[PDB]
Amino acid sequence: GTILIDLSPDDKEFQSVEEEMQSTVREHRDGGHAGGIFNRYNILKIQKVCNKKLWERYTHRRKEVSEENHNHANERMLFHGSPFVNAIIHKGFDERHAYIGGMFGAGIYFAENSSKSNQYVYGIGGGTGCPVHKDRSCYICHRQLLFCRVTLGKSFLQFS
Amino acid sequence: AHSPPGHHSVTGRPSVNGLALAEYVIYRGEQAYPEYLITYQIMRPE
Ligand SMILES: COc1ccccc1NC(=O)c1ccc(NC(=O)N(CCc2nc3ccccc3c(=O)[nH]2)Cc2cccs2)cc1
């Protein structure tokens, strides 16, 4: 059910997504171990993910949350990195593959910092890096992130 | 896992690294939609 629509670099929607990706890079306490050493990205492609059933699944849940929270879904746009992005875009996120070992227990994790999500593209802690060169700081291999609409509703605040 | 009772997500606020942004966890896959797929390279600092 999923189709991918390529955005033109001249499209303001491409531009605003790229700005969010670029502007939320930061340095990491691992000195680049997991995600690589970089200050910016070369954006190769930005595709809209179009799937009517997955969208309706989202908006159904969003309305449920909103109704439980004074008509406030508390919707954010956040990054997600993992080796499973190609499954996610076809089948949706599935909490049965939740990050069992995350800081906040077994759920599905998102970041404001694109560079945080980048640390997970090749696996937890960057795994062994890119499949071709086994390099977590590979500058050659193409990487993929999702930029996702996320319903937070009433969020539990964990200082950490 | 489930969200904490009376909550729909968790927000991980940074308490050490002053420059880190927040991280978030949801416990239901239906609470996120993958709007954009971004293909990229990281760039070697000049
Ligand atoms: C084949 O799988 C499927 C098949 C069919 C349908 C759906 C899917 N998959 C899923 O829905 C799914 C759901 C959850 C996860 N894992 C996670 O959330 N993590 C954390 C990875 C990460 N951590 C972060 C921490 C802080 C801030 C940002 C992030 C971030 O950006 N990413 C774990 C991983 C486990 C193995 C490699 S990484 C993965 C897929």
Ligand SMILES: [Zn+2]
């Ligand atoms: Zn590589």
